[PDB]
Coordinates of C-alpha atoms and ligand atoms in Angstrom, one line a residue:
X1 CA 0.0 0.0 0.0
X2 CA 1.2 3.1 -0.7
X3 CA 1.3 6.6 0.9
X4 CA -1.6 8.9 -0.4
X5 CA -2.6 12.6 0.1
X6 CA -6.5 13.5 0.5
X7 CA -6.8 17.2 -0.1
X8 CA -10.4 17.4 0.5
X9 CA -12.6 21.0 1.8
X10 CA -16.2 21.7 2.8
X11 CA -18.7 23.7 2.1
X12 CA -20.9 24.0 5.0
X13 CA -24.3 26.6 5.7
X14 CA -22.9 28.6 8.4
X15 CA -19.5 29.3 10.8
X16 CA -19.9 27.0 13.7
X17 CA -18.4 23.6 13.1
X18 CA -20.9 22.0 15.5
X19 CA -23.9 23.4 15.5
X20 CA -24.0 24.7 11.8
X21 CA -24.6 21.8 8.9
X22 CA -22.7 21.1 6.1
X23 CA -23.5 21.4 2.3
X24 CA -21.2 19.7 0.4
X25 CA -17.8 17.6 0.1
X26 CA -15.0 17.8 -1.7
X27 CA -11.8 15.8 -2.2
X28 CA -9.3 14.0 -4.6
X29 CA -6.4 11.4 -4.1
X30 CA -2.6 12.7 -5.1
X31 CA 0.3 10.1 -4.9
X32 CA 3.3 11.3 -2.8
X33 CA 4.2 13.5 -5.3
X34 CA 0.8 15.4 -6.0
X35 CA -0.2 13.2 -8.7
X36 CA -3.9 13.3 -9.1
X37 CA -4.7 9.5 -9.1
X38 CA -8.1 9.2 -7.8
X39 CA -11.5 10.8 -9.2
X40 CA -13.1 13.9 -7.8
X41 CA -15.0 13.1 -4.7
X42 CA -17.8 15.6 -4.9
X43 CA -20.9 15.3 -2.5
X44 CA -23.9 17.3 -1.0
X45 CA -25.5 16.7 2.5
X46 CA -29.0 16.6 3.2
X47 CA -30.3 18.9 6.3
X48 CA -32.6 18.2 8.4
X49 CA -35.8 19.8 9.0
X50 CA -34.8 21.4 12.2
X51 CA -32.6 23.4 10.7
X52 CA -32.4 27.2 8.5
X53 CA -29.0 27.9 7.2
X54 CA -27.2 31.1 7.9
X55 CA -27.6 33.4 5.1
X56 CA -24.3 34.6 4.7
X57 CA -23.1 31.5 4.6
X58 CA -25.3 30.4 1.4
X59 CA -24.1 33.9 -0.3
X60 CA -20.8 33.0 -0.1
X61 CA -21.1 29.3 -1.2
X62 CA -23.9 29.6 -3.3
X63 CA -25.6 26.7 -2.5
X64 CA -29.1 27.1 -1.3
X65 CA -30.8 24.4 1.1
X66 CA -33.0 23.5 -1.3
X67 CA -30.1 22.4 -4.0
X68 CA -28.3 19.9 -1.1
X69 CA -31.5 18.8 -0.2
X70 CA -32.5 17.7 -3.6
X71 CA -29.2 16.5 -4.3
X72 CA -27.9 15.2 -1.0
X73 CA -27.8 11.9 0.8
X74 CA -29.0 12.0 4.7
X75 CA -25.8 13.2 7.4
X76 CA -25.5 9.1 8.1
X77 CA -25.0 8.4 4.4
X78 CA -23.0 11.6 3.8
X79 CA -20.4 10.9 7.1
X80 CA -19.9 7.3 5.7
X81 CA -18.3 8.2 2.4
X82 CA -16.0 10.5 4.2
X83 CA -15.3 7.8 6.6
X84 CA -14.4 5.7 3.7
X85 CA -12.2 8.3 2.2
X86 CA -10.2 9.4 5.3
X87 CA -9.9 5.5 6.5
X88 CA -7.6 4.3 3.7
X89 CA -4.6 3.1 4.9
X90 CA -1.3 5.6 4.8
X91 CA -3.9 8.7 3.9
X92 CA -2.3 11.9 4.7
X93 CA -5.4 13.9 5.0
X94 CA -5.3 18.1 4.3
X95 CA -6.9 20.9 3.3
X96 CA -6.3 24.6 4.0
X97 CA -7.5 25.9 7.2
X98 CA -8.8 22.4 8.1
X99 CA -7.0 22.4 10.9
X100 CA -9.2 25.0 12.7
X101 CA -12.4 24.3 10.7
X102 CA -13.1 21.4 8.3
X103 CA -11.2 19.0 11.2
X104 CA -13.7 20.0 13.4
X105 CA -16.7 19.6 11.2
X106 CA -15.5 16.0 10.4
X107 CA -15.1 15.2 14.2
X108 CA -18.6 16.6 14.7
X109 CA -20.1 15.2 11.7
X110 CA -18.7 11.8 12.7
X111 CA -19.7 12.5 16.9
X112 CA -23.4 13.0 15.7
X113 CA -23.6 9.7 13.4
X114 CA -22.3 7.2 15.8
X115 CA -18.6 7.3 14.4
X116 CA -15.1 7.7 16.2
X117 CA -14.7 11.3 16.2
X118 CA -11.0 11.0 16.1
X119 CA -9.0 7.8 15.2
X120 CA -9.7 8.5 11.4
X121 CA -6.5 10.8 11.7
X122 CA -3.8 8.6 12.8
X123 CA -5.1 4.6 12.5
X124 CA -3.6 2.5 9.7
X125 CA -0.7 5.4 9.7
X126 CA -2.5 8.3 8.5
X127 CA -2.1 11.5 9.3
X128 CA -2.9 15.0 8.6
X129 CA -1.6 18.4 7.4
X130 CA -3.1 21.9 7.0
X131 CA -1.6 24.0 4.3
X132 CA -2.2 27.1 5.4
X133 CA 0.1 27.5 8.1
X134 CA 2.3 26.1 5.7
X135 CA 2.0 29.3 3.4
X136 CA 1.8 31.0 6.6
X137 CA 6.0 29.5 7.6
X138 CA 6.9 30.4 3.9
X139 CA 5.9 34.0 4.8
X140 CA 7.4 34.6 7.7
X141 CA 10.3 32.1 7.4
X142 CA 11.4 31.9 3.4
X143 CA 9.8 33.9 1.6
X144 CA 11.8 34.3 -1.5
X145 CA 10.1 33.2 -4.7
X146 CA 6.6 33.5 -3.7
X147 CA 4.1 36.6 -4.5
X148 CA 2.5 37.7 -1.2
X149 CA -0.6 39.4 -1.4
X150 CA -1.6 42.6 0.8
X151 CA -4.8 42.9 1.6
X152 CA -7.2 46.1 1.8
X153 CA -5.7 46.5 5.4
X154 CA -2.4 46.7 4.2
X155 CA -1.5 43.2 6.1
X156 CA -0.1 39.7 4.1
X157 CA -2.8 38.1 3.4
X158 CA -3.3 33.8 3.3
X159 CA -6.4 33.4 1.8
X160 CA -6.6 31.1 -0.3
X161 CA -8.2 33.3 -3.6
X162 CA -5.5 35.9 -3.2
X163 CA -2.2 33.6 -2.9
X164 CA -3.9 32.0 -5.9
X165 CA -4.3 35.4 -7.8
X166 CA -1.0 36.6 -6.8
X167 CA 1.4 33.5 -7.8
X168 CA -0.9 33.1 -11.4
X169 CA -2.5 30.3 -10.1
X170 CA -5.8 29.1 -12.4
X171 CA -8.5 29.2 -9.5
X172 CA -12.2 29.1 -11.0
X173 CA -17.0 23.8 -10.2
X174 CA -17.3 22.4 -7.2
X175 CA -13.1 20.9 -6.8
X176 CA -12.1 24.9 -7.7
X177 CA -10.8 25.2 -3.8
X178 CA -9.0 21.4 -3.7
X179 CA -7.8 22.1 -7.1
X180 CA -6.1 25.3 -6.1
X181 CA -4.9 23.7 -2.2
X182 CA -2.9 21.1 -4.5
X183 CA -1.3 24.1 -6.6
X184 CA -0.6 25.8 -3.4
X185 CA 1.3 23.1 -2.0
X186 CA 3.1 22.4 -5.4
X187 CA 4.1 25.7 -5.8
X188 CA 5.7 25.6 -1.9
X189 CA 7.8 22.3 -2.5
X190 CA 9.2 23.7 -6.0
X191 CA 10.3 27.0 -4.7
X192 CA 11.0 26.3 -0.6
X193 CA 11.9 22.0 -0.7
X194 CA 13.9 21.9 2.3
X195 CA 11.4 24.1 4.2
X196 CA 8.6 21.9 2.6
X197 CA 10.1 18.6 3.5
X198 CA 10.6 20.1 7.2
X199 CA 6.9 21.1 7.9
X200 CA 5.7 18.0 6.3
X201 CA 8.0 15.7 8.5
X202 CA 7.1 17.6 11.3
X203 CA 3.8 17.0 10.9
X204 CA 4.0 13.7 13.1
X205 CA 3.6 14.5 16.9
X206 CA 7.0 12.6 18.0
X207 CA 9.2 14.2 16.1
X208 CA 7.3 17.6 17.3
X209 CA 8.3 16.0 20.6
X210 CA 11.7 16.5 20.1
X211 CA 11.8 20.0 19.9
X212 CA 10.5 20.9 23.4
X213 CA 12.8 21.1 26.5
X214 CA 11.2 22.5 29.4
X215 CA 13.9 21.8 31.6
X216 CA 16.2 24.1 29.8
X217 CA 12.6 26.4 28.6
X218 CA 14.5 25.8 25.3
X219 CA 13.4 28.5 23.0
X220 CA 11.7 27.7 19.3
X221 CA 10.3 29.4 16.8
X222 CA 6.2 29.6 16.7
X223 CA 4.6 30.3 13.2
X224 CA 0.4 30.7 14.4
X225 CA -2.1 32.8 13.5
X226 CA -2.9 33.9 17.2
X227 CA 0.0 36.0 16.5
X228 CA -1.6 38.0 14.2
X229 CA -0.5 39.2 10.5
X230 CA 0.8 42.2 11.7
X231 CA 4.0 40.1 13.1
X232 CA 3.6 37.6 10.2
X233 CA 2.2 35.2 12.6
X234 CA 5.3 34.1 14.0
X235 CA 7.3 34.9 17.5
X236 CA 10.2 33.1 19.8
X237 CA 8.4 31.0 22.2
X238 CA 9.7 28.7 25.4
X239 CA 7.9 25.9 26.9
X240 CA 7.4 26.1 30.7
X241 CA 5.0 22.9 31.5
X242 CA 2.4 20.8 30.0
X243 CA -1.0 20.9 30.4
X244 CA -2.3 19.5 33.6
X245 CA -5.1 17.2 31.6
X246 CA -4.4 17.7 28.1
X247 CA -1.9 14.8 26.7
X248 CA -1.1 16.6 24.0
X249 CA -0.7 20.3 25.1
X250 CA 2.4 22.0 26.3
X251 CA 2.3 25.5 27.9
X252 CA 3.7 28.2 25.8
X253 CA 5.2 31.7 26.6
X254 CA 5.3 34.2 24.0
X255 CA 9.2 35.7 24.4
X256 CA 8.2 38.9 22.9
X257 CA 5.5 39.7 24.8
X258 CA 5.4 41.1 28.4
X259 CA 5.9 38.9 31.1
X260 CA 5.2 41.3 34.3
X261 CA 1.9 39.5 35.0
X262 CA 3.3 36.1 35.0
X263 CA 6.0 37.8 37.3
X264 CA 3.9 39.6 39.6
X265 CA 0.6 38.1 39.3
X266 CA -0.7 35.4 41.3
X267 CA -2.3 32.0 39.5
X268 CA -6.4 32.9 40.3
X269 CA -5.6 36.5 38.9
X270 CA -3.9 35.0 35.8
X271 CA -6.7 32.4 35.2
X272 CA -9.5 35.1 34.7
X273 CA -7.3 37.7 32.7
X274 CA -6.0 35.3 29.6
X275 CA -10.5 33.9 29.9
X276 CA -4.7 45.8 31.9
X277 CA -1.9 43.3 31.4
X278 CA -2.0 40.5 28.7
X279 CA -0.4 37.2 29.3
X280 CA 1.6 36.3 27.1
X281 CA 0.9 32.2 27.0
X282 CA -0.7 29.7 24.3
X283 CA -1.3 26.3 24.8
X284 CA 0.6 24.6 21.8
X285 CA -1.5 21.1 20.5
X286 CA 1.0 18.6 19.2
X287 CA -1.9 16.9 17.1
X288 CA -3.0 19.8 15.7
X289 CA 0.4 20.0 13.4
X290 CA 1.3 23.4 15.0
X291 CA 4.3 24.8 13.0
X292 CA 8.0 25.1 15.3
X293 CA 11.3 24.5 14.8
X294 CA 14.7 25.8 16.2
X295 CA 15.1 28.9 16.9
X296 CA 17.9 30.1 15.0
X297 CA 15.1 28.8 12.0
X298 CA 14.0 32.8 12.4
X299 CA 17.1 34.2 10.6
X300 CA 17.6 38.0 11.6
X301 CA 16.4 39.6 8.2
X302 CA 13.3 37.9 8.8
X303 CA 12.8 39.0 12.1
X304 CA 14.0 42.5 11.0
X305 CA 11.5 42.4 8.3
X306 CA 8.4 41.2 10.9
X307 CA 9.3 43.8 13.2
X308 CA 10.6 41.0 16.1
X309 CA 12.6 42.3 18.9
X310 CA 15.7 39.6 19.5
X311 CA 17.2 41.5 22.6
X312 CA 13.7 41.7 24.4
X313 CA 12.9 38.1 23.8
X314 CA 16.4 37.0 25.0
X315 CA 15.5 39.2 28.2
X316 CA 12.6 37.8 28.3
X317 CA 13.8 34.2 28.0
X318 CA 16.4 34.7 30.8
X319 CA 14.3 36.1 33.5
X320 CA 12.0 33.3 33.1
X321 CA 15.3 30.7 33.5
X322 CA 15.8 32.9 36.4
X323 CA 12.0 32.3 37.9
X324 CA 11.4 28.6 37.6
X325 CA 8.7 29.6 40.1
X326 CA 6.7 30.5 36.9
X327 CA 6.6 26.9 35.7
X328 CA 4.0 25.7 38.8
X329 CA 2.1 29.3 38.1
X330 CA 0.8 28.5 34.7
X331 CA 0.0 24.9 35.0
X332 CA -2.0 25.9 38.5
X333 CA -3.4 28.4 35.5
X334 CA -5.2 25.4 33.6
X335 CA -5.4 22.9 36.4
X336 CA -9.0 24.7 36.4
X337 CA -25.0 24.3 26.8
X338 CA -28.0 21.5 27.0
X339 CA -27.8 21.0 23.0
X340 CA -26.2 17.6 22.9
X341 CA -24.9 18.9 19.7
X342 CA -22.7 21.6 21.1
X343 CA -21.4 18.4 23.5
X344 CA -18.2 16.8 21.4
X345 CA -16.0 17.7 24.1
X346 CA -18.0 16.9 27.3
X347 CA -15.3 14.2 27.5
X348 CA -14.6 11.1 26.0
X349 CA -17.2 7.9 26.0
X350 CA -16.3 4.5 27.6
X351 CA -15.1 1.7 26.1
X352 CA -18.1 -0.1 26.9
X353 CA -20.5 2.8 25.5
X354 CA -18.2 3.0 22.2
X355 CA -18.7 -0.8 21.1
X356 CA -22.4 0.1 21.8
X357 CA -22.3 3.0 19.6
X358 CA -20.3 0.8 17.0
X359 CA -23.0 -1.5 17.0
X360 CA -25.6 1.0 16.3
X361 CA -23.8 2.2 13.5
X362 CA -23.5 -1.2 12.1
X363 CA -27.2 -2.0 12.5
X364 CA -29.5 -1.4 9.6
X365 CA -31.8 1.3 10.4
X366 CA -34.6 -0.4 10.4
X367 CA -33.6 -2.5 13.0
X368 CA -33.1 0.2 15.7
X369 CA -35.9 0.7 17.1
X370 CA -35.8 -2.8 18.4
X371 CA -32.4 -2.3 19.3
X372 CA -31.6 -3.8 22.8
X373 CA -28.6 -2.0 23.7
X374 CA -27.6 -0.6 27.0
X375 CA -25.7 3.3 27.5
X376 CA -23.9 4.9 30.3
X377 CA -23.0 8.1 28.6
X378 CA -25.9 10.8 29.1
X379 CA -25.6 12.0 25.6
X380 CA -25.8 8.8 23.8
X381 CA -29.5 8.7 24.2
X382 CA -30.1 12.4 22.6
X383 CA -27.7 11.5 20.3
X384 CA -29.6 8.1 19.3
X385 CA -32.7 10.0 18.5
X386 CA -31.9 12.6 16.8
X387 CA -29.5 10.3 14.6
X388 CA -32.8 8.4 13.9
X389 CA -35.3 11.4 13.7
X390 CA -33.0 13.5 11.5
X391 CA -31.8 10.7 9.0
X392 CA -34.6 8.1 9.4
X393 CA -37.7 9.9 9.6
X394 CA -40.0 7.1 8.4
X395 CA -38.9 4.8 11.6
X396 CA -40.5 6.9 14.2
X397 CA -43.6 5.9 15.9
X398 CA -46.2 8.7 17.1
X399 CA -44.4 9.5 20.3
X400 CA -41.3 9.5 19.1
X401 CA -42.9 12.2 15.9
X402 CA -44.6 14.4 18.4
X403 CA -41.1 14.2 20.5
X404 CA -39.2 15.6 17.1
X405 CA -42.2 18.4 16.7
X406 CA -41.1 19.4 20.2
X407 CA -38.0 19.8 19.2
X408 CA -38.5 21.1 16.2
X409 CA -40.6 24.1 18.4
X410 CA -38.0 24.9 20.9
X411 CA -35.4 25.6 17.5
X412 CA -37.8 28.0 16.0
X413 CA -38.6 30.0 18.5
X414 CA -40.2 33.4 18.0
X415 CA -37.5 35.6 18.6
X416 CA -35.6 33.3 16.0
X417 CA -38.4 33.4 13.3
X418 CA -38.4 37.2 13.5
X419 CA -34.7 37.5 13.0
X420 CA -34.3 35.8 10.5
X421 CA -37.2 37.1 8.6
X422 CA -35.5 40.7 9.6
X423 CA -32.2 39.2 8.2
X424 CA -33.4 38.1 5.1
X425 CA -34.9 41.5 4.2
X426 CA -32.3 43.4 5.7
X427 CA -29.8 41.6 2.9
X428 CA -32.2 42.3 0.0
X429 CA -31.9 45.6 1.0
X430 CA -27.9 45.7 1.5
X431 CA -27.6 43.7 -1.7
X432 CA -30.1 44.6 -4.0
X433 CA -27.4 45.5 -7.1
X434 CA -26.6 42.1 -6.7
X435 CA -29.0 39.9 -8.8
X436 CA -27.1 36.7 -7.9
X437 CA -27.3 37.2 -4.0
X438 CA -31.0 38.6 -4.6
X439 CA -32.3 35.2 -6.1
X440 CA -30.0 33.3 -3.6
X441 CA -32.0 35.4 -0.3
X442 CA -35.8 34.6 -2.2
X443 CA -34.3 30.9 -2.2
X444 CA -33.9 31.3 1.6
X445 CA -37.3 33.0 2.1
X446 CA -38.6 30.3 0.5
X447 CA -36.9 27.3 2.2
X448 CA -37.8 28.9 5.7
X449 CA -41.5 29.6 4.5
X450 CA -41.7 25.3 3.9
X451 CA -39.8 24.6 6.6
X452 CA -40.9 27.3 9.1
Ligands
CF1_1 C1 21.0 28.2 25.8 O1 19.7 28.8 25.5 C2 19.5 29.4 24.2 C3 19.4 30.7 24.1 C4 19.2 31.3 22.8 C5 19.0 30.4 21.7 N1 18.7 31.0 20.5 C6 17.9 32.0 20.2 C7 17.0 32.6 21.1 C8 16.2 33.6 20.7 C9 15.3 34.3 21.7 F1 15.5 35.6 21.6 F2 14.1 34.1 21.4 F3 15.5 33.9 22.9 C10 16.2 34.1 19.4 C11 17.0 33.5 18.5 C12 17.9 32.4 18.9 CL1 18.9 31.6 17.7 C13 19.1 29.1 21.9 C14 18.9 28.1 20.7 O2 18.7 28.6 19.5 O3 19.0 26.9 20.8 C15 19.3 28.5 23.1
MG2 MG1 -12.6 25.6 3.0

């Protein structure tokens, strides 16, 4: 078997991973050299009738509810052809900010139809990659050879349209975005290799590992976007401790910011300012492919250019040495919603209840109502129903119908109804010289008049 990518990217009807739905799929299959050997992979999701999409969402896509309706497959049907997809052994599975959002669609799209919300990613040795902290290292670490596009704000800009547009990239069809996320990682191992072949190594979490000495609060080089544009997303950063309960966080500081309140402050103080002085400390996720590297990576032109101030971060770096009291103040820092939806992260199910969900997922529909099966978790049985109500309408008996009307109620509640209406007519009004986004927002009028 060999090593595959999966560039894939979704189009979903509003912002919120969890509790917004998604529209449609994308993805194709490159060899290890970003050979396109598969077919495109192009699907649409069903939503269910509890649901109105946020209009701005559907302006942007151009999908309207009533076109992923018609064409779509229920949520179940939709999350098992990703499943397929992203289960293929040796998968190296990307997109560009999928990290942050189309990860977190998949996890929820897989918690809410009775699939492992996380093993897809590293089982059978897959992993995954996000190229747009990729473009975001170029920038700030190598950026010779590549165009990079200001936006109107006067700040580099890494969306995807404008690196595109700037480099003479073809960027138009449904694949146009995972078309244009293969050209963008192309055009990064042509022009930076050894850079590319670094960040792509270092995808792995072990080898991540390697980098961080607390002991020593070795300092690295941080490339994030919680740093903001302004500093090209990157600064020096030190480790100080892992995270208390999180396996896979380590306690960042932030070298160039100010440290005084770490100094000074005590740990209950500190706890409610980072949730007057900022603290300068991230939690770094090791499964998240965050991008570091030595620090000496930064070369001084570079930090020149992004306006990074060695001698204050090397001040910075030795007080802290200095004050290993500081270590046992931040992890003391992070020692530390009834929609089952909003619920991923409420913790992690038992053994026990996750061969119980397995088997639900392997039953065929029709056979789970007289499902004798037995739950521990409270969300599992929220999570049953509306799995069945939602995807399987035609299994519900009266009760369980006038339980989904209920529901279906307490969504579209009056102040809802009237904001959206409001919305809707406010948008007309803001767009009205464009005819495309008019006919999309009567689409919406109409969807929410049928579904009400
Ligand atoms: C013994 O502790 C140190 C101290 C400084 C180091 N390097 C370094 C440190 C910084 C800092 F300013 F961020 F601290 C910027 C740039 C570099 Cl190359 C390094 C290092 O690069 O390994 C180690
Ligand atoms: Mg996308």
């Amino acid at each position: 078997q060999q090593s595959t990518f999966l560039f894939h990217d979704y189009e979903t009807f509003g912002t919120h991973p969890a509790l917004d739905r998604p529209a449609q799929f994308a993805a194709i299959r490159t060899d290890s050299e970003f050979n396109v050997i598969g077919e495109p992979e192009v699907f649409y999701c069903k939503p269910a009738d509890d649901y109105l999409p946020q209009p701005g969402a559907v302006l942007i896509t151009g999908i309207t509810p009533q076109e992923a309706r018609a064409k779509g497959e229920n949520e179940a049907a939709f999350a098992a052809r990703i499943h397929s997809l992203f289960t293929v052994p040796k998968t190296c599975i990307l997109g560009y900010n999928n990290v942050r959002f189309d990860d977190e669609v998949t996890r929820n799209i897989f918690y809410r139809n009775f699939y492992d919300p996380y093993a897809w990613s590293w089982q059978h040795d897959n992993s995954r990659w996000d190229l747009l902290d990729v473009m975001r290292a170029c920038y700030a670490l190598r950026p010779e050879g590549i165009n990079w596009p200001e936006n109107d704000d006067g700040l580099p800009s890494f969306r995807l349209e404008h690196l595109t547009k700037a480099n003479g990239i073809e960027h138009s069809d449904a694949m146009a975005d995972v078309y244009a996320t293969i050209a963008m990682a192309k055009l990064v191992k042509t022009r930076q290799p050894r850079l590319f072949d670094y960040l792509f190594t270092h995808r792995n979490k072990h080898k991540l590992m390697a980098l961080i000495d607390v002991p020593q609060m070795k300092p690295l080089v941080h490339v994030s976007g919680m740093f903001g544009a302004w500093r090209g997303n990157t600064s020096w950063v030190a480790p100080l401790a892992w995270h208390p309960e999180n396996r896979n966080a380590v306690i960042m500081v932030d070298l160039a910011g100010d440290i005084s309140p770490l100094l000074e402050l005590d740990s209950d103080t500190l706890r409610e300012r980072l949730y007057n002085a900022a603290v300068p400390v991230k939690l770094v996720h090791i499964n998240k492919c965050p991008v570091l590297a030595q620090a000496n990576t930064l070369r001084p032109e570079d930090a020149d250019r992004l306006g990074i101030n060695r001698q204050h971060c090397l001040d910075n770096l030795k007080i802290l040495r200095e004050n290993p009291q500081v270590r046992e103040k931040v992890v003391a820092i992070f020692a530390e919603s009834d929609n089952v939806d909003a619920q991923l992260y409420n913790g992690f199910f038992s053994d026990a209840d996750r061969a119980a969900m397995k088997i639900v997922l392997e039953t065929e529909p029709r056979n789970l109502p007289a499902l004798d099966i037995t739950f521990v978790d409270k969300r599992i049985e929220k999570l049953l129903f509306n799995y069945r109500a939602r995807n399987f309408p035609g299994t519900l008996d009266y009760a369980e119908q006038q339980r989904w009307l209920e529901h279906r109620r307490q969504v579209f509640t009056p102040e809802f109804l009237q904001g959206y209406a409001d919305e809707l007519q406010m948008l007309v009004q803001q767009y009205a010289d464009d005819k495309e986004k008019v006919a999309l927002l009567k689409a919406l009028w109409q969807y929410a008049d049928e579904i009400v």
